[PDB]
Design a protein around this ligand. Structure first.
Ligand SMILES: O=C[C@H](O)[C@H](O)[C@H](O)CO
Lengths: 204, 196
């Protein structure tokens, strides 16, 4: 019901597109002004520093698309693999932002290895969720979350500075979820796939 | 003070000047998009200020990821919907960059409607390609439920094409192997969905 956030996100996106593709020197200056207005609006109405907002909201290059998050979906004995971050104390599927220069499966494999110690392969395309569709909170950013099924083929469980705990959980014993990293409804869809792996793939 | 009102009027005034003076069709489209949004903003919050959202950037880091391109995969009795591109006069599936504010399926529906005039539904996730600007290319299947064929200033031609009568492909928009894979899915339903 906070309508203004999404208008301002659309204004920045169009200003970014203009700064990328316009060859008209007065129009390029128009798009910069518009981008700078989007930062001023966000800065004021979030009480966030102007230059911090510029970095977080308005420093991308090229046409603006949603950002990509990857979530690795690994089962053992009908229990789903979760990792707990030391700092926030909350639990999620292994994954994170898609690093530029990596394919979606290369991100899944790297994130699982760094967060859990496990080697994985045998990738399956499970789902794409739109983070903003029924999102609890307003978002400055738009995210698509790709869920990739993987098989453990090696390594061994290893914790780290960032990851305090690596554990499997059944559908009826879920730990305290980082809703920012995975929703309860996304976890339910992954247990549905585990029960019926030939089921249609969820795409928002 | 209510600061949003003066900022939106600045946006409106810049967009109006852009609209008047631009000769480039894509700049005119951008300024029209900005005009449209400015109209929508002024028709709400008649008296109220905007809600302050002090936690909006709490867990934001400015992390950049690959860009998303979407291609809509639309079959009509074993022929695939292609579009002749203004930019090169070569052919591609309807699609383009996924826009902020749109789900993957809304993107596929939007691009199909604007490029061809067809309404589509019954979306299926077919594939995500990336042969390593960095781009993840999402292929979404859907079916015509409505509308009718319509050429444009950007889309000179709309044409269905079989696997042995494929036009000159716009290779950046869709590779030969990507098109082949799509025919494979139509012919062998529940073939393993590719993810790079
Ligand atoms: O790529 C898609 C963009 O809409 C066009 O390339 C821009 O309008 C720039 O001309």
């Amino acid at each position: 019901t906070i309508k203004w956030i999404d208008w301002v996100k659309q204004i920045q996106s169009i200003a970014q597109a203009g700064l990328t593709y316009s060859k008209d020197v007065y129009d390029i200056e128009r798009f910069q002004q518009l981008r700078d207005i989007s930062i001023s609006m966000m800065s004021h109405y979030t009480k966030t520093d102007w230059e911090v907002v510029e970095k977080l909201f308005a420093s991308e290059t090229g046409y603006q698309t949603p950002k990509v998050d990857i979530r690795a979906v690994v089962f053992q004995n009908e229990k789903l693999l979760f990792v707990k971050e030391k700092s926030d104390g909350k639990w999620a599927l292994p994954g994170g932002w898609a690093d530029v220069g990596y394919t979606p499966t290369e991100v899944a494999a790297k994130e699982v290895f760094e967060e859990t110690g496990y080697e994985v392969d045998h990738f399956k395309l499970l789902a794409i969720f739109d983070k903003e569709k029924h999102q609890p909170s307003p978002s400055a950013t738009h995210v698509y979350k790709i869920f990739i099924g993987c098989e453990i083929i090696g390594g061994e469980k290893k914790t780290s500075i960032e990851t305090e705990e690596v554990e499997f959980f059944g559908e009826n014993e879920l730990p305290n979820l980082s809703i920012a990293r995975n929703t309860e409804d996304q976890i339910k869809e992954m247990f549905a796939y585990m029960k019926d792996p030939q089921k249609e793939k969820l795409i928002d």
